[PDB]
Design a binder for this molecule. Sequence first.
Ligand SMILES: *[C@@H]1O[C@H](CO)[C@@H](O[C@@H]2O[C@H](CO)[C@@H](O)[C@H](O)[C@H]2NC(C)=O)[C@H](O)[C@H]1NC(C)=O
Ligand SMILES: *[C@@H]1O[C@H](CO)[C@@H](O[C@@H]2O[C@H](CO)[C@@H](O)[C@H](O)[C@H]2NC(C)=O)[C@H](O)[C@H]1NC(C)=O
Lengths: 212, 247, 85
Amino acid sequence: WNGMMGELLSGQADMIVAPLTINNERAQYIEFSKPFKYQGLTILVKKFSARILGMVWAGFAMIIVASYTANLAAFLVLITGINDPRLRNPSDKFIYATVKQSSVDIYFRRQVELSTMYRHMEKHNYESAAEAIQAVRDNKLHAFIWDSAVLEFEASQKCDLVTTGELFFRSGFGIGMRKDSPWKQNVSLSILKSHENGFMEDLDKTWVRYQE
Amino acid sequence: LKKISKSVKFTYDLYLVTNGKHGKKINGTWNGMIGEVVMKRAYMAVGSLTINEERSEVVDFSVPFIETGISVMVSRTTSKIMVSVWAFFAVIFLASYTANLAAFMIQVSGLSDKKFQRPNDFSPPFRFGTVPNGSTERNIRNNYAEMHAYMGKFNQRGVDDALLSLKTGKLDAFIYDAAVLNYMAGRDEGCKLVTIGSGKVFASTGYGIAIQKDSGWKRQVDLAILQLFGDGEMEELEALWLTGICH
Amino acid sequence: LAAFMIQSGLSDKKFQRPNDFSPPFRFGTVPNGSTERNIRNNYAEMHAYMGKFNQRGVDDALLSLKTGKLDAFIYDAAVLNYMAG
Ligand SMILES: *[C@@H]1O[C@H](CO)[C@@H](O[C@@H]2O[C@H](CO)[C@@H](O)[C@H](O)[C@H]2NC(C)=O)[C@H](O)[C@H]1NC(C)=O
Ligand SMILES: *[C@@H]1O[C@H](CO)[C@@H](O[C@@H]2O[C@H](CO)[C@@H](O)[C@H](O)[C@H]2NC(C)=O)[C@H](O)[C@H]1NC(C)=O
């Protein structure tokens, strides 16, 4: 292993506090508490005979202007998640990328039905979410599979940032721990006691709820 | 449960509780599904059990498989040329107004509401209550004493009774579990009854499975649930049971 | 006004008489197939006309049709439905 789990199992760390993606590999090696986050996965995208003729021509002018009004009114009035076929078999145009050595890549590798996607994201994996956001802001990217809350805060920050529709794999973020330790029961009880009252709403007022 | 017994290979048999509904520590004694598991007359309780700190000290709850909360539901020659130019400009303005018109044609605060924190304290007396002896009633008493005291005269006894009383106008707002009131909203006759906002949840928690204290199965019981989300069986199952009609 | 705002086949004359109209038409199919066999046994002259418009693959017919080098392509029904979608 490497990263946060590589450091925690080496003993150099004691308790991982971060947006930790709860999955099946981690639960076998290390312990968790109740997740403090609720969200799924989505995509970030960027955004007197003459008198008879005279009256007849007056009627003609009226019908012509009515038709012009009708046509001007008609002129002035009249991807979607993973289920995009153009992303089922992508090309060099639609560029969807994800973070290298992140939990999402392992999650997509688990389901071999998205092997071609695993064979496409491998060529454009970026180290950090900031790199992907900057590259897609330069319109060098076209899609970015990532968490919902982070991309929502980013869309609040940057008005050109837009999300898709599908909300799938509704997991949570929790606190990674060491193995069975008395730093578990009271920790999970504290997390639950924080969730029950208005503390989470206050923290959202601080960072999550606010818009830019 | 059918999915559960398949992979851990344990046998079982069901029966229905006779005393209590969901659990109430009366004189220090718990009843319902929780009360039996404390008495160990049963080893597992499955149903609609709300995870909270108070109930987590007598039993153990496995990882929740569905997210819910507490919600409230309510019932839904140059001069002549210049004049001609002005008339043309007015027709243009008129056209813009019409086209724009056709285009446009083609195109409560919450629990802490003033009417809630000050119920029956406004020109129009308001009304709202909930079913007693439940987890939601316990939460209200421990965070808003006066608000809990007000609801004592609007206590219901069932989901249907609250829906009908709300339909008849005898009640103005009904507070109950978030997960089930979502089900009734999408399956009511018409779409007359709705929840506050686009779906707002207070005090997020989960539904859990009650197990006898310090069981040796809790390691294996929850590990199966995590396998369900990773593979994705809940999506099909929830569409089978929890889908709705109204949008 | 508001309501208004809210609002042949194989035996075609151009087919049975190909290149017999002011605008010469063009159409062909892949040889050595079941479809080619059926045409020769029901319309000899129509089969004879297509000899100069014979293709060699599904993609080639689609691109040639896109480029305008061909006007109509005759092939199996099941697969051409797949390519259309
Ligand atoms: C909560 O529990 C109490 C006690 O069991 C219920 O009160 C009973 O209500 C029934 C029906 O009206 C009476 O016959 C009993 O005599 C009552 N007992 C007592 C001691 O009050 C109450 O109805 C329950 N509320 C709900 C529906 O949860
Ligand atoms: C149909 O079959 C004939 C005969 O095999 C093909 O004609 C051959 O084409 C290749 C490639 O040009 C030549 O090397 C052979 O000498 C040709 N043989 C004869 C006898 O014509 C023809 O191309 C095939 N057509 C298709 C694609 O169905």
